[PDB]
Amino acid sequence: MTTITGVVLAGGKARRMGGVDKGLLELNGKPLWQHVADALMTQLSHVVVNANRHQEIYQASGLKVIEDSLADYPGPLAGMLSVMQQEAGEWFLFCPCNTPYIPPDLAARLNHQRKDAPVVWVHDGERDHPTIALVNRAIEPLLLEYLQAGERRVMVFMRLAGGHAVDFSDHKDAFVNVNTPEELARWQ
């Protein structure tokens, strides 16, 4: 009953009892994933999080936590598919839990620039961010087929699905990633 569901992708796996839980690192007191969820809630009424470790902690801010299917598909596409299989509604705006500075016109600009494509993603002027992506329902069967086929490559999938990049080069450092504790330390 809203047009796009926002989704924070907080990672899959724990293919060696985790390591650092990136989404739970705190940037100025607030977990990175909650920075992203808050930014998505500025622009979208319905936001959920895909998390596969420390689920009770993710649950504490009162959003729906969605875990990956038993299929244990690889890579960020596995989380995308698991969320489309467990949420209704025609459009999803995915964003990793690592990009706390995403802007309040993310959804609006991706939608304005979608131009009939079933998926679009952010390009920051330097690189693609294919997991910051507005994705239509129609992608779900294609994603299932790709991951059942043993594939993992994100950009290859986005190309196969007929997507395109949307230029956010004018949004300075809104798309920076905080992948390690060492980077985070800098941004405080």
Ligand SMILES: [Li+]
């Ligand atoms: Li642990």
